[PDB]
Amino acid sequence: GARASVLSGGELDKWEKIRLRPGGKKQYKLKHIVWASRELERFAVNPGLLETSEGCRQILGQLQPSLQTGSEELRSLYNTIAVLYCVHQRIDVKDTKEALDKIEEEQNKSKKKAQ
């Protein structure tokens, strides 16, 4: 399926069109996820969770209470996974802030039915 993910219409075509900060001029590149797998190996977490929507959801849930306490490098790792989740859900975003709004709307829906 990785062979399809690299075609011009797939998930990794979508990945490199996304902006850093709504005003910004930088974009995501493929090695951002490679770096995210390196951090998951450092923190002893299965890297295969990046390949799934369910794996990405739980990792975002693990990261969540420690974001402010953590440095902006941790937040960069979280943002990388939040953008990837948005790609896995087949939705386009223009920037990271927009991807974070997508996680927040899903959390608003999820929160209602989590009792």
Ligand X SMILES: *C(=O)CCCCCCCCCCCCC
Q: Which residues of the chain form contacts with ligand X (CB under 6 A)? A: 1-7, 11-12, 30-31, 33-34, 37, 50
Distance of closest approach, residue 113 Cβ to ligand X, in angstroms: 30
Question: What residues contact residue 33 under an 8 Å CB cut-off, 6+ apart?
Answer: 15, 50, 80, 84
Residue 31 interacts with which of its own copies, ligand X, none, CB < 5 to 8 Å by class: ligand X
H or E stretch covering 87: helix 72-88
Distance of closest approach, residue 70 Cβ to ligand X, in angstroms: 18
The amino acid at residue 109 is K
SS3 state at 56: helix
Of 30 and 91, the one with the shorter C-beta distance to ligand X is 30
